[PDB]
Amino acid sequence: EAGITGTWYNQLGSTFIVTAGADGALTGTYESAVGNAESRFVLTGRYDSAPATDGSGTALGWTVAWKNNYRNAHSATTWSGQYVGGAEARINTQWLLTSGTTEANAWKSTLVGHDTFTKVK
Amino acid sequence: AGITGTWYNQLGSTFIVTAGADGALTGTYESAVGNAESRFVLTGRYDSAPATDGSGTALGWTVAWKNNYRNAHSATTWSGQYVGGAEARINTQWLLTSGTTEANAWKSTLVGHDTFTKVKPS
Amino acid sequence: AGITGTWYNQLGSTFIVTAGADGALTGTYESAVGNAESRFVLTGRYDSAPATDGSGTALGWTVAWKNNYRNAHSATTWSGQYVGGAEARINTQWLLTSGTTEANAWKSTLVGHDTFTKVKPS
Amino acid sequence: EAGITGTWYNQLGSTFIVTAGADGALTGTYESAVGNAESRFVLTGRYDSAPATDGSGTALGWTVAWKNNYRNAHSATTWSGQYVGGAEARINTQWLLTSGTTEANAWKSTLVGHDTFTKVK
Numbered sequence: 084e085a086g087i088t089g090t091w092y093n094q095l096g097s098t099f100i101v102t103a104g105a106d107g108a109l110t111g112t113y114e115s116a117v118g119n120a121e122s123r124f125v126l127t128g129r130y131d132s133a134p135a136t137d138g139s140g141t142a143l144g145w146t147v148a149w150k151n152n153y154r155n156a157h158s159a160t161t162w163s164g165q166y167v168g169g170a171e172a173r174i175n176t177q178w179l180l181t182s183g184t185t186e187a188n189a190w191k192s193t194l195v196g197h198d199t200f201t202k203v204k
Numbered sequence: 205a206g207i208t209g210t211w212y213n214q215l216g217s218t219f220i221v222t223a224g225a226d227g228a229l230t231g232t233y234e235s236a237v238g239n240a241e242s243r244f245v246l247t248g249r250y251d252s253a254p255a256t257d258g259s260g261t262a263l264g265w266t267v268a269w270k271n272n273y274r275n276a277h278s279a280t281t282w283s284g285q286y287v288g289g290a291e292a293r294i295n296t297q298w299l300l301t302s303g304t305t306e307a308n309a310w311k312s313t314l315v316g317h318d319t320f321t322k323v324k325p326s
Numbered sequence: 327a328g329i330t331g332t333w334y335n336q337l338g339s340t341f342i343v344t345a346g347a348d349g350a351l352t353g354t355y356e357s358a359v360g361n362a363e364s365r366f367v368l369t370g371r372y373d374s375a376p377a378t379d380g381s382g383t384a385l386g387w388t389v390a391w392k393n394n395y396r397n398a399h400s401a402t403t404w405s406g407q408y409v410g411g412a413e414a415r416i417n418t419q420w421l422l423t424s425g426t427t428e429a430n431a432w433k434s435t436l437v438g439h440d441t442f443t444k445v446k447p448s
Numbered sequence: 449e450a451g452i453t454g455t456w457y458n459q460l461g462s463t464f465i466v467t468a469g470a471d472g473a474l475t476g477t478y479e480s481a482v483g484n485a486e487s488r489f490v491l492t493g494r495y496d497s498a499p500a501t502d503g504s505g506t507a508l509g510w511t512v513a514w515k516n517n518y519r520n521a522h523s524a525t526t527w528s529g530q531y532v533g534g535a536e537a538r539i540n541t542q543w544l545l546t547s548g549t550t551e552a553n554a555w556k557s558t559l560v561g562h563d564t565f566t567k568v569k
C-alpha cells in the first residue's frame with residue numbers, strides 16, 4: 084500500500100519507517116526522540132487493506148517493544164489510529180505505553196498519549 | 205508456562221499466540237463481541253528479556269478487523285503485561301480505532317481493558 | 327440503593343460520595359496507593375435521569391491531589407457508569423495527569439481502570 | 449485563580465467557561481460543537497491551587513454529564529490535563545466519554561480523545 088509505506092515523523096521528532104504489505108501487514112522500525120530509547124526498534128502491526136472509499140481514514144495499529152540490541156526499557160507501546168491520505172498525508176494516533184511493573188505497581192504501569200505523523204515526501 | 209498458548213478474556217474472546225525468541229508475537233484473535241466473525245490475524249511484540257525483579261513482561265499487539273467474512277474498517281491495539289505463575293495472566297488496556305471522516309474523528313476511538321488467562325470458559 | 331454511599335475499589339481506596347438530585351457528585355477520596363495520604367476533595371456529575379432500558383448511569387468525577395498533608399501536583403478523573411442491583415458497582419476508566427514541563431508532557435498522563443463496590447475490604 | 453478563570457475554546461469549536469476558586473474548585477458551563485449535545489451543560493472539577501513554580505503545568509480535571517434542561521445523551525465526559533500559563537495560555541487535555549450501556553454493551557461504552565483549549569483574551 085503506497086499510501087502508508089514510507090518515512091514518517093511525529094511532533095516529538097520521532098521517526099517511523101514502515102512498509103504496508105498486500106496482506107494487511109505493517110513492518111518497519113521506530114526511533115523515538117524521547118524516553119528510555121536509543122536507535123531503531125522493530126515494529127509490527129496491521130492495517131485495513133480494503134478501506135472504505137467514502138472519505139474515511141484507513142484504520143491501523145502497530146507495536147514497539149522497547150528492546151533492541153542496544154537498550155531495553157522493559158516496556159511496549161501500541162499506536163492505534165487512522166491514515167488520512169492525499170497530498171498532505173497524516174497518521175493520527177492514540178497510544179498506550181505499558182511498562183513492566185511489580186503487581187503492587189501495576190496501577191501506574193500505563194501512559195496514554197497522542198501522536199500525529201507527517202509523511203516525508 | 206509462557207506467553208505462547210491459547211488465552212481467553214473476560215468477554216470469551218480467544219487469543220492464540222506464539223512468542224518468538226527475539227520478541228515477535230504472531231497469532232490469531234477471535235472476538236466474542238462486535239463486528240467480527242471467526243479468526244483475524246494479529247501481530248505484536250514483547251520484551252524478550254524482562255527484568256528479574258518480579259516485574260511483568262511488557263507486550264502489545266494489533267488486530268485489523270478484516271478477514272474473509274467481514275471488514276469492520278477498524279483496528280484494535282492491546283498494550284499490557286504478562287504476569288507468570290500458577291495462573292498466568294495478561295492484563296491489557298486497548299484502543300479500538302475505526303476509520304472515520306475527519307469531522308467524526310473525535311468519536312473514532314474506543315478504550316477498554318481486557319484480562320486474559322489460559323482457562324477456557326464454560 | 328444508589329450512587330450515594332461509601333465505595334471501595336480493587337486497590338482498597340475509599341470513595342465517599344453524595345449524589346445530588348439534579349446531577350452533582352460531591353465527596354472525598356482516599357487512595358490506598360501513590361503520593362497521597364488521607365482524604366481529598368472530589369466533585370463530579372452523573373446522569374440524574376438514566377435510560378429505562380437496563381442501561382447503566384453515566385458519571386465522572388475529579389480529584390486534585392492536594393490536601394493538608396501533601397500535594398502531588400496531579401489530578402485524576404474517573405469516567406464510568408453505575409450499575410445497580412444486588413451488588414451495585416461503579417465501573418470506571420481513569421486519567422491521572424501530572425503537571426509537567428512541556429518537554430515531558432508526553433509522559434504526563436497515566437491511564438487505568440477501577441471497579442468500585444460497597445463491600446468493605448478485609 | 450486568574451489564569452484558569454475565563455472563556456476557552458477547543459479545536460472542535462466547543463466553548464468552556466470556568467471559574468477557578470481559591471479552594472481548588474472548578475465550576476462553569478460547557479457547550480460542545482459536536483455530538484448529542486445542545487446548549488450549555490454544567491461542569492464541575494478540581495485543580496491544583498498551589499502548583500509547582502519550576503516551569504510545570506497546573507494539573508486539573510473536570511466532568512460534564514450530558515444532561516441539561518434541553519437534552520439528555522445519557523453520557524458523561526471527563527477531561528484530565530494541565531493548564532500552561534503565559535501570554536498564550538492553553539489547557540491540554542485527554543478525555544474519556546462514557547455512555548450508559550447495557551452490561552452486554554459495556555465493552556464499547558467509552559470513547560477516548562484529546563482536546564486543546566485556547567483562552568479567549
Ligand SMILES: O=C(O)CCCC[C@H]1[C@H]2NC(=O)N[C@H]2C[S@@]1=O
Nearest residue numbers: 097115118119120156158160180
Ligand atoms: O520510555 C520508554 O519506555 C521507551 C520510549 C517510549 C517513547 C514514547 C514516545 N515517543 C514517541 O515517539 N511517542 C511517544 C509514545 S512511545 O511510547
Ligand SMILES: O=C(O)CCCC[C@H]1[C@H]2NC(=O)N[C@H]2C[S@@]1=O
Nearest residue numbers: 217235238239240276278280300
Ligand atoms: O467491532 C469491531 O470494530 C471489531 C471487533 C472489536 C472487538 C473488541 C472487543 N473484543 C474483545 O475481545 N475485546 C474488545 C476490544 S476489540 O477491539
Ligand SMILES: O=C(O)CCCC[C@H]1[C@H]2NC(=O)N[C@H]2C[S@@]1=O
Nearest residue numbers: 339357360361362398400402422
Ligand atoms: O500519586 C499521585 O499522583 C496521587 C495518587 C494517585 C492514585 C491513583 C490510584 N488510586 C486509585 O484509587 N486509583 C488509581 C487512580 S488515582 O489517580
Ligand SMILES: O=C(O)CCCC[C@H]1[C@H]2NC(=O)N[C@H]2C[S@@]1=O
Nearest residue numbers: 462480483484485521523525545
Ligand atoms: O455525544 C455525547 O454523548 C455528548 C457530547 C460529547 C461531546 C464530546 C466532544 N466535544 C468536545 O468539545 N470534546 C469532545 C469530548 S466530549 O465528550
